[PDB]
């Protein structure tokens, strides 16, 4: 869905760091804590939150609207690649008159140190 | 507020209170390794649920991190232990919620059982009550702190009030408090962390019935020493 | 309403209180051996336990006094031997035990005609301070296979034990009663904690009743005094 992704489809090899900012779009009166944690490749998905906490992790409170942004160290080409998981550290809490369900948008880009190398035209159409 | 690979987000402009006016220092005595690498980061205990019927919670240190963290791997492999703690208790509520949390630190928190009847004859409390791990344990009789010691005077210990109307976080820094410069880790619990409702949670119906108590803590000046078991 | 010396740690604790009484009757079921062993209990004096438990860590000297008479308060020509048995050394079991002769157990030889014996016991604990509250277990080992009644137990606060007996090979001619008074001297207290709320049920643990009580509830209603 990213422009980065569609561009990476036009090359075969790439290496860099990526930024992924998450944007909470709930009510203003809504608060809560989410636990974002990135686990490096090879190692499997952490079984629970507590075990996920003992690794690279980021505590996200809704005192910050969107400013929480994960920076993943390195991406290569030959669990081939590491996966980031988002966890409920704390239940969604709202007052009365506030919606009990909220949606959050993820936005992602590459840092300055990101590059692509060998070119390949792989587009569906036409 | 980032220390190591751990990143937590909280207010860095609150009322940080130091226990008995003394920061955790390194032992420069004769009783005897000082790790501050992956034993320096923030450990975040699973969230508890502040509720109307809640009686209160307590955690025993350093037992809470015995099995849960890398901190534990150094505490279970060394027969000697010494460390301070940075405790940060924060709950997230809305302007439509009420409550008042007393977060306190009572060193040598010995738990007691009960013994009713014409003849009093009781046993001694189990490990789950004595050393409840990171899960903690709910108070049985909060008014006497499960020890015949009145919570009415708990404020004589390192304390902070959490008023959902006023506060949101409580920060307590506790130094290594003990009669010996170095003690065991899996045997002696230097202190207990009390988080008890004085003014109970209330809200008009329709609001989220559980306010999330989050405990983020990190050992300030951990110094295990001893030798490797 | 001017001097604050009244409320110091020293003047609060320093006061010789009756801490235990030894009974050496002429004939009875209590002490048919004409001797007794009294382990030093600070909680011998009633109000003292709730007092010292205001703090967690403490340190003090103790001055012991021995008021000895017959159960009528009559003083009799009898020679007494008060022996102090340090934490290490073992307590005497028989009246002819070799514990009464062992020098490293200091002894006091007085008469009832002589004014009450008075000695001073230094801070005995191997730790830097006494400890009425131990949230854990004494041993530093994986031993967890027995009934852990060692919770709250802290055998480092052991102050030793006195051993009272009637001097001589033959049993005493008079019925005696020896009263022991302890007075705390140089005192330092460390970590303050709330004062006892409920009645004490046991000796080595802060257990309480199945039915909790309260300090006082005079006010029948909040409105009216």
Coordinates of C-alpha atoms in Angstrom, one line a residue:
Chain A
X1 CA 0.0 0.0 0.0
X2 CA 3.0 2.2 0.5
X3 CA 4.7 4.0 -2.3
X4 CA 7.9 2.5 -0.9
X5 CA 6.5 -1.0 -1.5
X6 CA 5.5 -0.3 -5.1
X7 CA 8.9 1.2 -5.8
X8 CA 10.6 -1.8 -4.2
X9 CA 8.7 -3.9 -6.7
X10 CA 10.8 -2.1 -9.4
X11 CA 14.0 -3.3 -7.9
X12 CA 15.4 -6.6 -6.6
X13 CA 17.8 -5.7 -3.8
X14 CA 17.4 -3.1 -1.1
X15 CA 18.9 -2.1 2.2
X16 CA 18.0 0.5 4.8
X17 CA 16.1 1.6 7.9
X18 CA 12.4 2.3 7.9
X19 CA 10.2 4.6 10.0
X20 CA 6.6 3.7 10.9
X21 CA 4.5 6.3 12.6
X22 CA 1.2 5.3 14.1
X23 CA -1.7 7.7 14.2
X24 CA -4.4 7.3 16.9
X25 CA -7.8 8.8 15.7
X26 CA -10.0 8.1 18.7
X27 CA -11.8 10.8 20.7
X28 CA -9.9 13.4 22.7
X29 CA -11.3 12.1 26.0
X30 CA -10.1 8.6 25.2
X31 CA -6.9 7.2 26.7
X32 CA -5.0 4.0 27.1
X33 CA -1.6 2.3 26.6
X34 CA -0.5 0.1 23.7
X35 CA 2.8 -1.9 23.5
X36 CA 4.6 -1.8 20.2
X37 CA 7.6 -4.2 20.0
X38 CA 9.9 -5.1 17.1
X39 CA 11.5 -8.6 17.1
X40 CA 14.5 -9.2 14.8
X41 CA 14.4 -11.9 12.1
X42 CA 15.2 -15.5 12.8
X43 CA 13.6 -15.2 16.3
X44 CA 9.9 -16.1 16.3
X45 CA 6.9 -14.0 17.3
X46 CA 6.9 -13.4 21.0
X47 CA 4.3 -15.6 22.6
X48 CA 2.9 -13.0 25.1
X49 CA 3.3 -9.3 25.9
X50 CA 5.6 -9.8 28.9
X51 CA 8.0 -11.9 26.8
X52 CA 7.6 -9.3 24.0
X53 CA 8.5 -6.6 26.5
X54 CA 11.9 -8.1 27.3
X55 CA 13.0 -7.3 23.7
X56 CA 13.0 -4.1 21.6
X57 CA 9.7 -2.4 22.6
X58 CA 7.9 0.9 22.8
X59 CA 5.3 2.0 25.3
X60 CA 2.6 4.1 23.5
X61 CA 0.3 6.1 25.7
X62 CA -2.6 8.2 24.3
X63 CA -1.1 11.3 25.9
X64 CA 0.6 11.3 22.6
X65 CA -1.8 11.5 19.6
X66 CA 0.4 10.2 16.8
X67 CA 4.0 11.1 17.8
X68 CA 4.8 7.4 18.5
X69 CA 7.0 6.1 15.7
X70 CA 9.0 2.9 15.5
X71 CA 12.5 2.9 13.9
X72 CA 13.5 -0.5 12.6
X73 CA 17.3 -0.9 12.3
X74 CA 18.0 -2.9 9.2
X75 CA 16.4 -4.6 6.2
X76 CA 18.1 -7.1 3.9
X77 CA 17.6 -9.7 1.2
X78 CA 18.8 -13.2 2.0
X79 CA 11.7 -15.8 9.2
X80 CA 13.7 -14.1 6.4
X81 CA 12.8 -10.6 7.8
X82 CA 11.8 -9.4 11.3
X83 CA 8.2 -8.5 12.3
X84 CA 6.7 -5.8 14.4
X85 CA 3.8 -6.6 16.7
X86 CA 1.4 -4.2 18.4
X87 CA 0.1 -5.3 21.8
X88 CA -2.6 -4.3 24.3
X89 CA -0.7 -3.1 27.4
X90 CA -3.9 -1.5 28.7
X91 CA -7.6 -1.7 27.9
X92 CA -9.3 1.0 25.9
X93 CA -10.9 3.4 28.4
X94 CA -13.4 6.1 27.7
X95 CA -16.0 8.2 29.5
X96 CA -19.7 8.2 28.8
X97 CA -20.7 9.7 25.4
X98 CA -17.4 8.6 24.0
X99 CA -17.3 5.9 21.4
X100 CA -16.1 2.5 22.6
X101 CA -14.3 1.6 19.4
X102 CA -11.5 3.6 17.7
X103 CA -9.3 3.1 14.6
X104 CA -5.6 3.9 14.2
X105 CA -3.8 4.5 10.9
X106 CA -0.3 3.3 10.3
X107 CA 2.1 5.4 8.2
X108 CA 5.4 4.2 7.0
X109 CA 8.5 5.5 5.1
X110 CA 12.2 4.8 4.7
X111 CA 15.0 6.8 6.3
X112 CA 17.9 8.6 4.5
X113 CA 20.1 5.5 4.6
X114 CA 17.7 3.4 2.5
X115 CA 18.8 2.4 -1.0
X116 CA 17.8 0.0 -3.9
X117 CA 20.2 -1.6 -6.3
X118 CA 19.3 -4.1 -9.1
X119 CA 16.3 -3.0 -11.3
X120 CA 13.5 -5.2 -12.4
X121 CA 10.2 -4.3 -14.1
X122 CA 7.5 -6.3 -12.4
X123 CA 4.1 -4.6 -12.8
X124 CA 0.7 -6.3 -13.2
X125 CA -0.5 -3.9 -15.9
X126 CA -0.1 -4.0 -18.7
Chain B
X1 CA 12.1 9.0 28.3
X2 CA 14.3 6.2 26.8
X3 CA 16.9 4.1 28.7
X4 CA 18.3 1.4 26.5
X5 CA 16.0 -0.5 24.2
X6 CA 13.0 0.3 26.4
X7 CA 10.9 3.4 25.6
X8 CA 8.1 4.6 27.8
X9 CA 6.1 7.8 27.5
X10 CA 5.3 9.8 30.7
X11 CA 5.3 13.3 32.2
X12 CA 8.8 14.4 33.1
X13 CA 7.4 17.3 35.1
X14 CA 5.7 15.7 38.1
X15 CA 6.4 15.3 41.8
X16 CA 9.2 12.8 42.0
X17 CA 9.8 11.8 45.6
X18 CA 12.9 10.0 46.9
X19 CA 12.4 7.5 49.7
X20 CA 13.7 8.9 53.0
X21 CA 15.7 11.5 51.1
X22 CA 18.4 9.2 49.7
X23 CA 19.3 8.2 46.2
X24 CA 20.4 4.6 45.5
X25 CA 24.2 4.5 45.8
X26 CA 26.8 2.0 44.9
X27 CA 28.3 -0.1 47.8
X28 CA 31.9 1.0 48.4
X29 CA 32.4 -1.3 51.4
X30 CA 34.0 -4.7 51.9
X31 CA 30.9 -6.9 51.6
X32 CA 31.4 -8.5 48.2
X33 CA 29.9 -6.7 39.7
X34 CA 28.0 -3.7 38.6
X35 CA 25.7 -4.3 35.6
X36 CA 23.9 -1.4 34.0
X37 CA 23.5 -2.7 30.4
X38 CA 20.3 -4.8 29.8
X39 CA 19.6 -4.6 33.5
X40 CA 19.1 -0.9 33.4
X41 CA 16.1 -0.8 31.0
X42 CA 12.4 -0.3 32.0
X43 CA 10.4 -3.4 33.1
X44 CA 6.7 -3.0 32.6
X45 CA 4.5 -5.3 34.7
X46 CA 1.1 -6.5 33.3
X47 CA -1.7 -4.0 33.9
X48 CA -4.0 -4.3 36.9
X49 CA -7.6 -3.3 36.9
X50 CA -8.7 -0.5 39.3
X51 CA -12.3 -1.3 40.0
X52 CA -15.2 -0.4 42.4
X53 CA -14.8 -3.5 44.5
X54 CA -11.0 -3.4 44.5
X55 CA -9.3 -3.9 47.8
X56 CA -5.7 -3.1 46.8
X57 CA -2.5 -4.7 45.4
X58 CA 1.0 -5.3 46.7
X59 CA 4.3 -6.4 45.0
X60 CA 7.3 -7.8 46.8
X61 CA 10.8 -6.6 45.8
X62 CA 13.1 -7.9 44.5
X63 CA 10.9 -11.0 44.0
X64 CA 8.8 -9.3 41.3
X65 CA 11.7 -9.6 38.9
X66 CA 13.1 -12.9 40.0
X67 CA 11.8 -14.9 37.0
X68 CA 10.3 -12.1 34.9
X69 CA 13.4 -10.3 33.6
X70 CA 17.1 -10.5 32.7
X71 CA 17.5 -8.8 36.0
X72 CA 16.3 -12.1 37.4
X73 CA 19.0 -14.1 35.7
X74 CA 21.6 -12.1 37.6
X75 CA 19.6 -12.4 40.9
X76 CA 19.2 -16.2 40.6
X77 CA 22.8 -16.9 39.6
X78 CA 24.4 -14.7 42.3
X79 CA 24.1 -15.5 46.0
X80 CA 24.4 -11.8 46.9
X81 CA 22.2 -8.9 45.8
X82 CA 22.0 -5.2 46.3
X83 CA 19.9 -2.6 44.3
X84 CA 17.7 0.4 44.4
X85 CA 14.5 0.9 42.4
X86 CA 12.8 3.6 40.3
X87 CA 9.0 2.9 40.7
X88 CA 6.5 4.6 38.4
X89 CA 2.8 3.9 39.0
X90 CA 0.5 5.5 36.4
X91 CA -3.1 5.0 35.6
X92 CA -5.1 6.3 32.6
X93 CA -8.5 7.7 33.4
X94 CA -11.0 10.2 32.0
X95 CA -12.3 13.4 33.5
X96 CA -15.5 11.5 34.3
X97 CA -13.8 9.0 36.6
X98 CA -13.0 9.3 40.3
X99 CA -10.7 7.6 42.8
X100 CA -7.6 8.0 45.0
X101 CA -4.7 5.6 45.0
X102 CA -2.2 5.5 47.8
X103 CA 1.1 4.2 46.3
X104 CA 3.6 3.4 49.1
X105 CA 6.8 1.5 49.9
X106 CA 7.0 -0.3 53.2
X107 CA 10.4 -2.1 53.8
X108 CA 10.2 -5.5 55.5
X109 CA 6.5 -6.0 54.7
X110 CA 5.7 -9.1 56.6
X111 CA 2.3 -10.5 55.7
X112 CA 0.0 -12.1 58.4
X113 CA -2.8 -14.6 58.2
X114 CA -5.9 -14.9 60.4
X115 CA -7.0 -17.1 63.3
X116 CA -10.7 -16.9 64.4
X117 CA -12.4 -19.1 66.9
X118 CA -12.4 -19.9 70.6
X119 CA -8.9 -21.2 70.1
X120 CA -6.5 -19.3 67.8
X121 CA -4.2 -21.7 65.9
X122 CA -2.9 -20.5 62.5
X123 CA -0.3 -21.5 60.0
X124 CA 2.2 -19.3 58.2
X125 CA 1.3 -17.6 54.9
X126 CA 2.1 -19.4 51.6
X127 CA 4.7 -18.3 49.0
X128 CA 2.0 -16.9 46.8
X129 CA 1.0 -14.5 49.6
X130 CA 4.6 -14.0 50.8
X131 CA 6.3 -13.7 47.4
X132 CA 3.6 -13.2 44.8
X133 CA 5.9 -12.6 41.8
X134 CA 5.1 -9.9 39.3
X135 CA 1.4 -10.8 39.3
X136 CA 1.2 -9.3 42.8
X137 CA -1.4 -10.2 45.3
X138 CA -4.7 -8.6 46.4
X139 CA -5.0 -7.5 50.0
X140 CA -7.3 -9.6 52.2
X141 CA -7.9 -7.0 54.9
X142 CA -6.7 -3.6 53.5
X143 CA -7.6 -1.6 56.6
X144 CA -4.9 -3.4 58.6
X145 CA -2.6 -4.2 55.6
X146 CA -2.9 -7.9 56.2
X147 CA -0.5 -7.5 59.2
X148 CA -2.5 -5.8 61.9
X149 CA -0.8 -2.5 60.8
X150 CA -3.2 0.3 60.0
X151 CA -3.1 1.9 56.6
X152 CA -4.3 5.0 58.3
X153 CA -0.7 5.8 59.0
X154 CA 0.9 4.4 55.8
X155 CA 2.0 7.9 54.8
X156 CA 5.1 7.6 57.0
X157 CA 6.6 5.4 54.3
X158 CA 7.7 6.7 50.8
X159 CA 4.3 7.6 49.4
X160 CA 2.4 9.4 46.7
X161 CA -1.2 10.1 46.1
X162 CA -3.0 9.3 42.8
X163 CA -6.1 11.5 42.5
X164 CA -7.8 10.8 39.1
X165 CA -9.1 14.4 39.4
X166 CA -5.6 15.7 40.0
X167 CA -2.8 13.2 39.3
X168 CA -2.3 10.4 36.8
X169 CA 1.2 9.1 37.8
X170 CA 3.1 8.4 41.0
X171 CA 6.9 8.1 41.0
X172 CA 8.9 6.6 43.9
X173 CA 12.6 6.1 44.0
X174 CA 13.7 3.7 46.7
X175 CA 17.3 3.1 47.8
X176 CA 18.7 -0.3 49.0
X177 CA 17.2 -0.4 52.5
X178 CA 18.5 -3.2 54.7
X179 CA 20.4 -4.1 57.9
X180 CA 23.1 -5.7 55.7
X181 CA 25.1 -4.1 52.8
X182 CA 24.5 -7.3 50.8
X183 CA 21.6 -9.8 51.1
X184 CA 20.0 -12.7 49.2
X185 CA 17.7 -12.2 46.3
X186 CA 15.3 -15.2 46.3
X187 CA 15.1 -15.3 50.0
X188 CA 14.8 -11.8 51.5
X189 CA 12.3 -9.3 50.1
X190 CA 13.7 -5.9 51.1
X191 CA 10.4 -4.2 50.7
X192 CA 6.8 -4.3 49.4
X193 CA 5.0 -1.9 47.1
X194 CA 1.5 -1.0 48.3
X195 CA -1.1 0.4 46.0
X196 CA -4.3 0.8 47.9
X197 CA -7.7 2.5 47.3
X198 CA -8.6 5.0 50.0
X199 CA -11.3 6.8 48.0
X200 CA -13.1 4.1 45.8
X201 CA -13.6 4.3 42.1
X202 CA -17.0 5.7 41.0
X203 CA -18.6 6.6 37.7
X204 CA -22.0 7.0 36.1
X205 CA -23.0 3.8 34.2
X206 CA -21.8 3.6 30.7
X207 CA -18.1 4.5 31.4
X208 CA -15.3 2.0 31.2
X209 CA -15.6 0.1 34.5
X210 CA -11.9 -0.6 34.8
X211 CA -9.1 2.0 35.1
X212 CA -5.7 0.6 34.1
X213 CA -3.0 0.6 36.7
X214 CA 0.4 0.4 34.9
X215 CA 3.6 -0.3 36.7
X216 CA 6.8 0.6 35.0
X217 CA 10.0 0.1 37.1
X218 CA 13.7 0.0 36.6
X219 CA 16.6 -0.8 39.1
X220 CA 18.6 2.4 39.5
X221 CA 21.9 1.2 40.9
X222 CA 21.8 -2.6 40.6
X223 CA 24.9 -4.3 42.1
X224 CA 24.7 -8.0 42.3
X225 CA 28.3 -9.1 43.1
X226 CA 28.9 -12.4 44.8
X227 CA 29.8 -15.3 42.5
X228 CA 28.2 -17.3 39.7
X229 CA 26.1 -20.2 40.9
Chain C
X1 CA 5.9 23.5 76.5
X2 CA 9.5 24.4 75.7
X3 CA 12.0 21.5 76.0
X4 CA 11.9 18.8 73.3
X5 CA 14.2 16.4 75.1
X6 CA 11.2 14.5 76.4
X7 CA 10.3 13.0 73.0
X8 CA 13.8 11.7 72.0
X9 CA 14.4 8.1 71.1
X10 CA 16.5 7.7 74.2
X11 CA 14.1 9.1 76.8
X12 CA 11.2 7.3 75.1
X13 CA 12.7 3.8 75.5
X14 CA 15.2 4.2 78.4
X15 CA 13.4 3.0 81.5
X16 CA 13.9 -0.2 83.5
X17 CA 10.8 -2.4 83.2
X18 CA 9.9 -5.8 84.6
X19 CA 10.8 -8.1 81.8
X20 CA 10.5 -11.6 83.3
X21 CA 10.3 -13.5 86.6
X22 CA 12.1 -16.7 87.5
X23 CA 10.4 -19.0 90.0
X24 CA 12.4 -21.4 92.1
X25 CA 9.9 -23.0 94.5
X26 CA 10.6 -25.3 97.5
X27 CA 8.5 -28.1 95.9
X28 CA 6.2 -28.0 92.9
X29 CA 5.7 -28.8 89.2
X30 CA 7.2 -25.7 87.8
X31 CA 10.9 -26.0 88.6
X32 CA 11.7 -29.2 90.5
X33 CA 15.3 -28.8 89.5
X34 CA 15.9 -25.5 91.4
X35 CA 17.0 -23.8 88.3
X36 CA 15.6 -22.1 85.1
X37 CA 16.7 -20.7 81.8
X38 CA 15.3 -17.3 80.6
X39 CA 15.8 -16.3 77.0
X40 CA 16.0 -12.5 76.7
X41 CA 12.6 -11.4 75.5
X42 CA 12.1 -7.6 75.0
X43 CA 8.4 -8.4 74.8
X44 CA 8.4 -9.5 78.4
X45 CA 7.4 -6.0 79.2
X46 CA 3.9 -5.7 77.8
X47 CA 3.8 -2.3 76.1
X48 CA 7.3 -2.7 74.8
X49 CA 6.5 -4.8 71.8
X50 CA 4.1 -2.3 70.3
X51 CA 6.6 0.4 71.1
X52 CA 9.7 -1.0 69.3
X53 CA 7.6 -2.2 66.3
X54 CA 7.0 1.5 65.5
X55 CA 10.4 1.1 63.7
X56 CA 11.8 -1.8 61.7
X57 CA 15.6 -1.5 62.4
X58 CA 16.9 -0.8 65.8
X59 CA 20.1 -0.9 67.9
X60 CA 20.7 -0.8 71.6
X61 CA 22.5 -1.8 74.8
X62 CA 20.5 -3.3 77.7
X63 CA 21.0 -3.0 81.4
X64 CA 19.6 -5.9 83.4
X65 CA 18.6 -5.9 87.1
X66 CA 17.7 -8.8 89.3
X67 CA 15.3 -8.2 92.2
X68 CA 15.3 -11.4 94.2
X69 CA 13.2 -12.4 97.2
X70 CA 10.9 -15.1 98.6
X71 CA 7.3 -15.1 97.3
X72 CA 6.5 -13.1 100.5
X73 CA 9.2 -10.5 99.7
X74 CA 11.3 -11.8 102.6
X75 CA 15.0 -11.7 102.0
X76 CA 16.9 -14.8 103.0
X77 CA 20.5 -15.8 103.4
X78 CA 20.8 -17.5 100.0
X79 CA 23.6 -17.3 97.4
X80 CA 22.5 -17.0 93.8
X81 CA 24.3 -17.5 90.5
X82 CA 23.1 -15.6 87.4
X83 CA 24.9 -16.9 84.3
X84 CA 24.8 -15.3 80.9
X85 CA 24.8 -17.8 78.0
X86 CA 25.8 -16.1 74.7
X87 CA 24.0 -16.9 71.4
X88 CA 26.8 -19.3 70.4
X89 CA 27.3 -21.4 73.6
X90 CA 24.6 -24.0 74.5
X91 CA 22.2 -23.6 77.4
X92 CA 22.4 -25.8 80.5
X93 CA 20.1 -28.8 80.7
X94 CA 20.8 -30.3 84.1
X95 CA 21.7 -28.7 87.4
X96 CA 25.1 -30.4 87.3
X97 CA 25.7 -29.5 83.7
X98 CA 29.2 -28.4 82.6
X99 CA 27.6 -25.2 81.3
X100 CA 27.6 -23.7 84.7
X101 CA 31.4 -24.0 84.9
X102 CA 32.3 -22.9 81.4
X103 CA 34.1 -19.5 81.7
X104 CA 33.0 -18.0 78.4
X105 CA 29.5 -17.9 79.9
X106 CA 29.9 -15.0 82.4
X107 CA 28.3 -15.5 85.8
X108 CA 27.1 -13.2 88.6
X109 CA 27.3 -14.4 92.2
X110 CA 25.1 -12.4 94.5
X111 CA 23.1 -12.7 97.7
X112 CA 19.5 -11.6 98.4
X113 CA 20.9 -9.5 101.2
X114 CA 23.0 -7.8 98.6
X115 CA 21.2 -5.1 96.4
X116 CA 19.8 -6.4 93.0
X117 CA 22.6 -7.6 90.7
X118 CA 23.2 -5.2 87.8
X119 CA 25.0 -5.9 84.5
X120 CA 25.0 -4.5 81.0
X121 CA 24.6 -6.4 77.7
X122 CA 26.1 -5.0 74.5
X123 CA 24.6 -5.1 71.0
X124 CA 24.8 -8.8 70.3
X125 CA 23.4 -9.1 66.7
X126 CA 25.9 -10.1 64.0
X127 CA 24.0 -7.6 61.8
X128 CA 24.4 -3.8 62.0
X129 CA 21.0 -3.5 63.6
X130 CA 18.2 -5.6 65.2
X131 CA 15.2 -6.4 63.0
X132 CA 11.7 -7.1 64.3
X133 CA 10.4 -7.6 60.8
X134 CA 11.9 -10.0 58.3
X135 CA 10.0 -10.4 55.0
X136 CA 11.7 -13.6 54.0
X137 CA 13.7 -16.6 55.2
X138 CA 17.0 -16.9 57.3
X139 CA 18.7 -19.6 55.3
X140 CA 20.5 -18.7 52.0
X141 CA 19.7 -22.0 50.4
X142 CA 17.3 -23.8 48.0
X143 CA 15.9 -25.7 51.0
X144 CA 12.1 -25.5 50.4
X145 CA 11.0 -29.0 51.2
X146 CA 9.8 -28.6 54.8
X147 CA 7.0 -26.7 56.5
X148 CA 8.3 -23.1 56.2
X149 CA 7.5 -21.8 59.7
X150 CA 10.7 -19.9 59.3
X151 CA 8.8 -17.0 57.8
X152 CA 9.3 -13.9 59.9
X153 CA 12.0 -15.7 61.9
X154 CA 15.3 -13.8 62.3
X155 CA 17.8 -15.7 64.5
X156 CA 20.2 -12.9 64.3
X157 CA 18.4 -10.8 66.9
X158 CA 19.3 -13.5 69.5
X159 CA 20.5 -11.6 72.5
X160 CA 21.5 -14.8 74.5
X161 CA 20.0 -16.1 77.6
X162 CA 20.4 -15.8 81.4
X163 CA 20.6 -18.9 83.7
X164 CA 19.4 -18.6 87.3
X165 CA 20.3 -21.2 89.9
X166 CA 20.8 -21.7 93.7
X167 CA 24.5 -22.1 94.3
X168 CA 25.6 -25.3 96.0
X169 CA 25.5 -29.1 95.6
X170 CA 22.4 -29.5 97.6
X171 CA 19.0 -27.9 97.0
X172 CA 18.2 -24.5 98.4
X173 CA 16.5 -24.3 101.9
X174 CA 14.4 -21.2 101.0
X175 CA 11.6 -20.7 98.3
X176 CA 12.9 -18.0 95.9
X177 CA 11.5 -15.8 93.2
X178 CA 13.9 -13.8 90.9
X179 CA 12.5 -10.9 89.0
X180 CA 14.4 -9.5 85.9
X181 CA 14.3 -5.8 84.8
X182 CA 15.6 -4.7 81.4
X183 CA 16.5 -1.1 80.6
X184 CA 17.4 0.1 77.1
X185 CA 20.4 2.4 77.0
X186 CA 22.0 3.9 73.8
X187 CA 19.2 3.5 71.3
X188 CA 18.9 4.3 67.5
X189 CA 15.8 3.6 65.5
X190 CA 15.7 3.6 61.7
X191 CA 12.6 2.9 59.5
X192 CA 9.3 4.2 60.9
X193 CA 6.2 2.2 60.3
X194 CA 2.6 2.5 61.5
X195 CA 1.8 1.5 65.1
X196 CA 0.1 -1.8 65.8
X197 CA -3.7 -1.8 65.0
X198 CA -5.0 -5.1 66.2
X199 CA -4.1 -7.4 69.1
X200 CA -1.0 -9.5 69.0
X201 CA -1.8 -13.2 68.5
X202 CA 1.6 -14.7 68.4
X203 CA 5.2 -14.0 69.3
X204 CA 7.4 -14.2 66.2
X205 CA 4.8 -13.0 63.6
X206 CA 2.5 -10.1 63.1
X207 CA -0.6 -12.3 62.6
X208 CA -4.0 -10.9 63.6
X209 CA -7.5 -11.9 64.3
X210 CA -10.1 -13.2 61.9
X211 CA -12.3 -10.4 63.0
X212 CA -10.7 -7.0 62.6
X213 CA -11.5 -4.2 65.0
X214 CA -10.8 -0.4 65.1
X215 CA -9.0 2.2 67.2
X216 CA -12.3 3.9 68.3
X217 CA -15.8 4.7 67.0
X218 CA -17.3 7.0 69.5
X219 CA -19.3 9.1 67.0
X220 CA -22.7 7.4 66.5
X221 CA -23.0 9.7 63.5
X222 CA -20.7 11.9 61.4
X223 CA -22.9 15.0 61.8
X224 CA -23.1 15.1 65.6
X225 CA -20.1 15.1 68.0

